[PDB]
Paper text:
One such highly networked epitope associated with control is QW9 (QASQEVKNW, HIV-1 p24gag residues 176-184). QW9 can be presented by the disease-protective HLA-B*5701 (hereafter B57), but also by the typically disease-neutral HLA-B*5301 (hereafter B53). Here we examine the CTL response to QW9, a highly networked epitope presented by the disease-protective HLA-B57 and disease-neutral HLA-B53. To explore the molecular underpinnings of differential cross-recognition of QW9 and QW9_S3T restricted by the two HLAs, we next determined the crystal structures of QW9-B53, QW9_S3T-B53, QW9-B57 and QW9_S3T-B57.
Despite HLA sequence differences within the binding groove and differences in TCR recognition, the structures of QW9-B57 and QW9-B53 can be superimposed remarkably well. Only two notable disparities exist in the conformations of QW9 bound to B53 and B57, at residues Q1QW9 and E5QW9. By contrast, for B57, a hydrophobic V97B57 takes the place of the R97B53, and the negatively charged E5QW9 hence points outward. Also, in QW9-B57, Q1QW9 projects outward toward the putative TCR interface, owing to the replacement of the R62B53-Q65B53 by the G62B57-R65B57. These differential residues located at the HLA α1 helix also generate a unique electrostatic potential (ESP) surface for each HLA. Of note, Q1QW9 projects outwardly and freely in QW9_B57 and might offer the putative TCR interaction at the N-terminus. Though QW9 can be presented by both B57 and B53, our flow cytometry results showed that HLA-I tetramers constructed with respective HLA alleles and loaded with the QW9 peptide only reacted with T cells from persons expressing the matched HLA molecule, with no evidence of cross-recognition between alleles, indicating a dominant influence of HLA genotype on TCR recognition of the pHLA complex. In contrast, QW9-specific CTL lines from B57+ persons maintained cross-recognition and killing of autologous cells loaded with the QW9_S3T variant (P-value: 0.5408).
Residue numbers in the entry:
A (entry chain A): 1 to 277
B (entry chain B): 0 to 99
C (entry chain E): 1 to 9
Amino acid sequence: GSHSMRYFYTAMSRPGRGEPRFIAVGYVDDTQFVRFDSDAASPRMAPRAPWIEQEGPEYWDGETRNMKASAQTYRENLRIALRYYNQSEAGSHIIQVMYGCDVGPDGRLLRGHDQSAYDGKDYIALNEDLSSWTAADTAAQITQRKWEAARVAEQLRAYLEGLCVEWLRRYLENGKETLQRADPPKTHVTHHPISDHEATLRCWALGFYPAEITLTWQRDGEDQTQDTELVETRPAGDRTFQKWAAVVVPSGEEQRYTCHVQHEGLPKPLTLRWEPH
Amino acid sequence: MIQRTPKIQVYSRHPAENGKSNFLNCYVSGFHPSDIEVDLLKNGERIEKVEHSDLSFSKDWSFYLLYYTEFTPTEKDEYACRVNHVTLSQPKIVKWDRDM
Amino acid sequence: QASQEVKNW
């Protein structure tokens, strides 16, 4: 189906403790494949997935040079932000950037992204047209005018439409056995008495990829979202994901509750009940 | 500056059964700023060789990290995750419960 | 592959 590539930058000043740190990670769909950390002894863009290791030394040397220069750029951007917001040198501040491309089943670009934040709030974003910007405040409008004057959006449109799509299609091919292979969740319902009159029903989904999933509890076919505790989808550590949903039910009503699991790796949605035997 | 306190989930990679090797995970998410300290505990004491993922963040700009170690669950041993963040008055300890 | 376009604020 659809796929995406994303890079995430975090630049963080640490006044009085050290130079500003710069961390970059790259993802194809829900799979991280590269990382860079300016705090490392030898800062290098490094592989984080098996299918990216086959890239030659020119790729890794080029990615490392880019990440080192990007780190210097965002160290300077942190100083500029202090100017725009009239903030002191004493405080620690954070710039975050995420950018990348979404492609459809045809490998055609669906949407490009280039979003920046300052201290965890929207700062400036490339619009869907890949030619204009949206600034969140008057400080970011200063940056916007500079980027309009320097024709920055044209350069990012060229990347998002070209190299982003081309490299993603190539990463998808090199890692086809995992990236284009959907693992359905393995599911079961557990039962945990709270008292002699109440019990928790927990519906589990384990070992699935990609992370998108829908878990819902129904009682006599009626959705129980308001009474369902739904944990965040969480990484298992082996590039698969887990999730559960739980409801507190009165003792004796357990068999009227059904868990419904929707995942693209499934031939069709599941319906689960507590299976005491 | 908006500060967001971390969500914490402590869990095993596979369904735990006593005496068999597994992985102990502590997933922290939804927090900001990025400064966070996570420790995996065995019987109240820090586990020494713990690895963590590279710092990333979600669409709302909040960060997330996975801390993990190899472990073998038993009946006598209690495992937990301890998280410190600027939003917390005391380090938050979440005990590992194989039912969660 | 990461974008090489420089973003000066």
